Amino acid sequence: CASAPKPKQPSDFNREPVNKTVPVEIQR
Amino acid sequence: CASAPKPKQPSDFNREPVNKTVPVEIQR
Amino acid sequence: LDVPSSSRYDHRIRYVTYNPADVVQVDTVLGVATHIMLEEGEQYLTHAFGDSEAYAFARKGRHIFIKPQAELANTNLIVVTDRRSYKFRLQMRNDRNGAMYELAFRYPDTQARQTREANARAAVEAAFEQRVGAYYNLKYMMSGDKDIAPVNAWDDGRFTYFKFSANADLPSIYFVDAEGNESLVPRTTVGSSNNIIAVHKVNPKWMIRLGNRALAIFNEAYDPNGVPNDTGTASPAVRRVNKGGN
Amino acid sequence: LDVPSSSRYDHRIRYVTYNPADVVQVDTVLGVATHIMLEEGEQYLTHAFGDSEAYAFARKGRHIFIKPQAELANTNLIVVTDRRSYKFRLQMRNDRNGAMYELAFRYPDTQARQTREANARAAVEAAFEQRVGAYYNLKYMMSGDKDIAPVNAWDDGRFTYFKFSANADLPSIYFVDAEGNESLVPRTTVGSSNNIIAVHKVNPKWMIRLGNRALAIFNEAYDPNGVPNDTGTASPAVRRVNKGGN
Amino acid sequence: LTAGGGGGGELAEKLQPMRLSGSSAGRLGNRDMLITQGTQLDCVLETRLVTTQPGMTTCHLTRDVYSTSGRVVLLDRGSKVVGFYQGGLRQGQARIFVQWSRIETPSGVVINLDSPGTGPLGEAG
Amino acid sequence: LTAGGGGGGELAEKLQPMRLSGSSAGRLGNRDMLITQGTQLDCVLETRLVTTQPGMTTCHLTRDVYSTSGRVVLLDRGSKVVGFYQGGLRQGQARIFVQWSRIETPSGVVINLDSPGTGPLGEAG
Amino acid sequence: RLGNRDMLITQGTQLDCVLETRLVTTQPGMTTCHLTRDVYSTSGRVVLLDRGSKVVGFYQGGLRQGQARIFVQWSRIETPSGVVINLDSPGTGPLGEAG
Amino acid sequence: DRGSKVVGFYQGGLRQGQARIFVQWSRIETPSGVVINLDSPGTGPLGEAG
Numbered sequence: 001c002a003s004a005p006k007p008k009q010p011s012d013f014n015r016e017p018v019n020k021t022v023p024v025e026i027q028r
Numbered sequence: 029c030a031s032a033p034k035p036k037q038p039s040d041f042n043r044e045p046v047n048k049t050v051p052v053e054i055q056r
Numbered sequence: 057l058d059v060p061s062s063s064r065y066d067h068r069i070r071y072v073t074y075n076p077a078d079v080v081q082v083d084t085v086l087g088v089a090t091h092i093m094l095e096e097g098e099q100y101l102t103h104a105f106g107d108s109e110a111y112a113f114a115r116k117g118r119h120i121f122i123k124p125q126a127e128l129a130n131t132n133l134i135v136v137t138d139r140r141s142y143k144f145r146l147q148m149r150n151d152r153n154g155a156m157y158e159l160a161f162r163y164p165d166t167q168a169r170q171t172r173e174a175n176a177r178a179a180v181e182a183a184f185e186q187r188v189g190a191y192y193n194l195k196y197m198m199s200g201d202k203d204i205a206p207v208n209a210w211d212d213g214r215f216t217y218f219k220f221s222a223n224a225d226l227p228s229i230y231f232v233d234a235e236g237n238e239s240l241v242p243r244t245t246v247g248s249s250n251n252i253i254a255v256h257k258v259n260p261k262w263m264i265r266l267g268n269r270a271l272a273i274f275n276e277a278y279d280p281n282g283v284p285n286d287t288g289t290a291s292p293a294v295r296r297v298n299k300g301g302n
Numbered sequence: 303l304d305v306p307s308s309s310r311y312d313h314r315i316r317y318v319t320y321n322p323a324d325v326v327q328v329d330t331v332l333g334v335a336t337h338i339m340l341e342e343g344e345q346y347l348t349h350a351f352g353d354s355e356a357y358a359f360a361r362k363g364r365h366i367f368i369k370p371q372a373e374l375a376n377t378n379l380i381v382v383t384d385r386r387s388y389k390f391r392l393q394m395r396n397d398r399n400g401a402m403y404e405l406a407f408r409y410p411d412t413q414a415r416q417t418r419e420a421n422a423r424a425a426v427e428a429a430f431e432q433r434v435g436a437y438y439n440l441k442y443m444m445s446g447d448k449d450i451a452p453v454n455a456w457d458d459g460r461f462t463y464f465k466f467s468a469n470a471d472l473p474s475i476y477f478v479d480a481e482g483n484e485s486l487v488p489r490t491t492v493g494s495s496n497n498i499i500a501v502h503k504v505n506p507k508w509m510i511r512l513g514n515r516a517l518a519i520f521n522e523a524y525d526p527n528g529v530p531n532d533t534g535t536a537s538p539a540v541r542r543v544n545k546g547g548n
Numbered sequence: 549l550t551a552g553g554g555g556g557g558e559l560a561e562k563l564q565p566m567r568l569s570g571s572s573a574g575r576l577g578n579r580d581m582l583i584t585q586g587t588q589l590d591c592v593l594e595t596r597l598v599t600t601q602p603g604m605t606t607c608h609l610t611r612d613v614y615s616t617s618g619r620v621v622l623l624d625r626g627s628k629v630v631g632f633y634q635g636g637l638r639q640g641q642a643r644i645f646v647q648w649s650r651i652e653t654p655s656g657v658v659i660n661l662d663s664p665g666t667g668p669l670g671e672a673g
Numbered sequence: 674l675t676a677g678g679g680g681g682g683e684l685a686e687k688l689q690p691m692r693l694s695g696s697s698a699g700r701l702g703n704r705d706m707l708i709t710q711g712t713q714l715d716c717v718l719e720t721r722l723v724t725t726q727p728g729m730t731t732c733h734l735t736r737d738v739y740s741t742s743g744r745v746v747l748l749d750r751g752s753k754v755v756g757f758y759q760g761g762l763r764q765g766q767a768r769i770f771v772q773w774s775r776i777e778t779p780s781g782v783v784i785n786l787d788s789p790g791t792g793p794l795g796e797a798g
Numbered sequence: 799r800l801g802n803r804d805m806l807i808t809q810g811t812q813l814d815c816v817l818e819t820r821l822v823t824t825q826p827g828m829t830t831c832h833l834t835r836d837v838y839s840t841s842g843r844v845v846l847l848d849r850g851s852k853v854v855g856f857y858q859g860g861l862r863q864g865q866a867r868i869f870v871q872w873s874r875i876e877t878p879s880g881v882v883i884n885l886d887s888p889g890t891g892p893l894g895e896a897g
Numbered sequence: 898d899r900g901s902k903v904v905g906f907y908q909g910g911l912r913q914g915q916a917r918i919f920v921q922w923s924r925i926e927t928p929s930g931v932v933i934n935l936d937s938p939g940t941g942p943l944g945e946a947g
Contacts, residue, residue, distance in 0.1 A: 007511065007514075007516060008447075008514060008515070008516045009516065010445060010446025010447060010509075010516045010517055010518045011445065011446060012445055012518070013445065014445055014446075014448070015443050015444070015445040015520070016443065016444060016445070017442065017443055017444075018442040018443065018444045018451065018452055018454065018455040018519065019440045019442060019454050019455060019456065020453075021454070022440065022454075023454040023456060023465055025454075025463070025465070025493070025498065026438050026440075026456065035265060035268075035270060036201075036268060036269065036270045037270065038199055038200025038201060038270045038271055038272045039199060039200060040199055040272070041199065042199050042200075042202070043197050043198070043199040043274070044197065044198060044199070044202075045196065045197055045198075046196040046197065046198045046205065046206060046208065046209040046273065047194050047196060047208050047209060047210065048207075049208075050194070051208040051210065051219055053208075053217070053219065053247075053252065054192050054194075054210060057312055058311075075311060077309040077310075077311045077312065077315050078309070078311040078312045078315070079312050079314060079315070079403060101362060101363075101365070102360075102362040102365055102367075102550075103550060104335045104337065104360060104367040104369070104549045104550060105335065105549065105550065105551075106333040106334050106335050106369065107333060108549060108550055108551045109551075112551070113550075113551055130333065131333050131334065131335075132333075132334045132335055132401075132403060134335055134337045134367065134403065134404065136337065136362075136365050141337065141339075141365075141404065143312075143315075143403050143404065184744060215743070225590075225592070225610035225611060226592075226608065226609075226610050226625050226626050227592060227610075228592045228593070228594050228608060230794075233513060233515075234447075234449050234515060235513075235514060235515070237513070237514075237793065238793075238794060239715065239793040239794055240594060240595065240713040240715070240793070240794060240795055241713070241715075242712060242713055242738070242739065242743075243608075243626075244654070244739075244741070244742070244743035245608075245624070245625070245626025245627075245654040246654070246743075250612075250624050250625050250626050250654055253626065254743060256736070256737075256739055256743065257469075257736060258469050265592075266592055266610070267592070267668075278469075279469065280467050280469055280470065281453070281467040281468060281469060282467060282468035282469035283468055284468045284494065284495035284497060285468065285495045285496075285737060285746060286494045286495050288745065288746045288749075289744055289745045289746065290739065290743060290744045290745070290746075291744070294744075296745055296746065298780065298781075298799075300782075300799040301799070302781075302799040302800070302801050335549060348675070349675065350674045350675060351674060351675070351676065354674065354675065354676035354677075355676065358549050358676070359675075359676055360549045360550070367549055369549055430843060461842070471715075471717070471735035471736055471750075472717070472733065472734075472735050472736075472750050472751050473717060473735070474717050474718070474719055474733065476893075483892065484892075484893060485814065485892040485893060486719065486720070486812040486814070486892070486893060486894055487812070487814075488811060488812055488837070488838065490779065490838075490840070490841070490842035491749070491750070491751025491752075491779040492779070492842070496737075496749045496750050496751050496779055499751065500842060502835070502836070502838050502842065503835060511717075512717055512735070513717070513793075531836065531845060534844065534845045535843055535844050535845065536838065536842060536843045536844070536845075537843070540843075542844055542845065544879060544880075546880075546881070548880075561680070562680075563680075564678050564679065564680025564681070565678030565680055565681075566678065566679075566680050566681030566684065566685050567678055567679075568685070568688065568936075571933055571934045571935060571936075572933070573931050573932065573933035574931070574932045574933065575930055575931055575932060576926070576930040576931075576932055579930050584902075584926055585693075585904045585923075585924060585926075586902050586903075586904040586926075594795065595791070595794065595795025595796070596792075596794040596795050596796045597795075597796065597797075598768065598792075598796040598797060598798075599797075600766050600767060600768040600797065600798060601766075601768050601769070601770045601797040601798035602770070602797065603789055603791065603795075603796075603797025603798065604711070604789055604791075604797070605795075606711040606713075606795065616926070616930075628709070628711050629711075630710045630711040650710060652701070652709055652710075652711075652741075656700050656701045656704055656741075657698050657699070657700055657701075658698070658699045658700065658701055658709075659696055659697070659698040659699065660696050661696055662693075662696075684938075687919055687921065687938075688921060688936050688937075688938065689936075690923060690934065690936045691906055691921075691923060719894065720890070720893060720894025720895065721891075721893040721894055721895045722894075722895060722896075723867065723891075723895040723896060723897075724896075725865050725866060725867040725896070725897060726865075726867050726868070726869045726896045726897035727869070727896065728888055728890065728895075728896025728897065729810065729888055729890075729896070730894075731810040731812075731894065753808075753810055754810075755809045755810035775809060777800075777808055777809075777810075777840075781799050781800045781803050781840075782799055782800075783799065783800055783808075
């Protein structure tokens, strides 16, 4: 009858790059 | 039916600056 | 042969600086007790006389007493402990002059280790207090029960400080996340009169509660980046280094 | 024959370089006890004398004291430990001069091995740090609750790195497979300020959770083939060789 | 190398005397470095409390606590008190017994007070 | 080769004194290398928790934890805490007792904290 | 402080294996699974357990009414190169839920 | 003197039919520092027990 809730599933709409700038750990 | 009450929420109306004057701990 | 160096008040008290590659020339006279003092916390392991009968040895912790019990008692004492091994060349004095009442040791390496640490601590406190080149954020707003409000609130990019007046009870401050849930944040109470609560985080919204009153603090200039903590301490001029090795 | 060499402070403090195929010349005098030290952490097995009564043997762990008990004590002491077997040729001196208070060993083989170990560690650390010939993939997109988002994400072909700002809590990162299920993936927190989370797997989709906010990370240039791990370490310039033999 | 009639069973057991020993007054030693019994420390609860499982509490002093002479501030304000509860409630009970175990002054002073925690007006638990 | 009257039973029993020994204040030694009791470590739960069977848990610190004086970062962010639960729930309980047992800093420091795990606001379990 | 972190897998590491033997809890029994991924050291620089290593565990005692998970103890893992280490560790689901 | 502070305690709760709890007062501290251990019953305003 009742089952355990699932965690929030993120929306798949506002897809944007993670990397706005090249990291310094890449040394660039 | 009965759930543990939440604490008071503050009214979001009277929004005024915390800092009326610059502190002396900022050396000012 | 390191010869004990006599003091300025009396000849009976002579000081020697330890040297692992050198021995101690102890000039004992007849019928006295020579009090050799070890370093504190030094655990005596074993000793070995040239003659077990020439000198009378009694030891209590780090206290050494010896006493000649025969004529022409020229032998050696090699007492070995957990930290080092002492070396003595017990040369009897025949005319009973210029006695040696106690032998005191000076350790150069230990004194250097203790003075280096003290100088390091002094530099650490100076660097913690100097607090140079920090940037302060004062764009804070509040709304709610103003009777428990701080008189000032700011942050330096690492901690958030709330300053309370002398007559105000110090309230409890809670970290508020995006959904509005509150969670404990660690705080340290600083200031000359203990009027400042320093919480260990920079956050856009805060919650202040005292009894059944609540106040909301809003950071109007939240910097999502901040300044990284490369040193391990709350100051950019004091490094935290790994001592334990292992 | 090994004649130990005296120090430059006292001539009665001699050292000798251990040579397993050679005995040491011990120049004992009357009434002066000689201290013989084994290496740190050595287990004494047994000793054997040329004459039991000519010399007096007392041992405490790695410490050994000997002292003559008879005239014309020209004999030998052979003592064995697990690491090696020490050889002593005890020659009594008639005129009671040039005694040996303490004899120490300079082991050449143990320090030769300890030098190879330190060179090996230096070379391995240099190899790890050099990180040469690495190809990076920055084609990462994200969608979800952006308030727990990294400031950078990339991978080198072996690990995936998520970099978080200084003011952001480090969230939990999960491994999303084709059907959409999540499963734990191991991670190590690297970076100077502990801001980078390196997970040990390259995957097309990831999931970031912190509390009740979730964010999804998509690899837009997923390479199924990858680069093989022929060495056993994270770096192509360090092997992992089997020591256990067996 | 080294040196070496008796009756009246009911009425006579009800007339058994109750002798309570007298007491003699003392004196407190130094009242500038002393906080005596019954002093009320006012702290503000930090951790939300739920009495399902035994647990540790935490509250912070709101006011400076002076000595009995009322001249020296002995427990600074913002001190962190640490307590604990256990055992849960029974039917009909509406207050849990909290014991506070240790308080830590912002300057470093640490004193083991094992004192009952009370409500805002001193009612137990 | 090798050399070698007493009556008043109820009222006199109810008047028995409760003498509680006093305390003496101490002082914390080094507060730049100390995390005192009651400190709140905020970690994010890694493992999904189902209390059918006893089990090990795991959570990662979200923020640097500072010393008592708040000047040195003692437990870095991203450290890995490890704990366990057991015994299941009873009827009427909605919280399980999780005890955290060890924590491992990203630089290799390991310290056995056998502390209770609580909710986001300190509620036990 | 941990001694060598290049030769160390510490507590709470999540080893991810794929179950080989179909599991039926009528009788006490022995399970088996194979690591799907290389398991790195704590420093994350040396591969200590290879992929394809064979873990061996067991269960016993069955289920009780209301229980939908069995407790599996993993007992040993044997690397493709010969290394054998006795990890007596709990077995969990894909997200660490016990049993 | 007046203003002395007295400290007491109770325990055991009430039974049914009881409307008074037995309080025992333990110590008293004079405003000048005197301390005497009186272990005495606490009564009401007119000396009724508990």
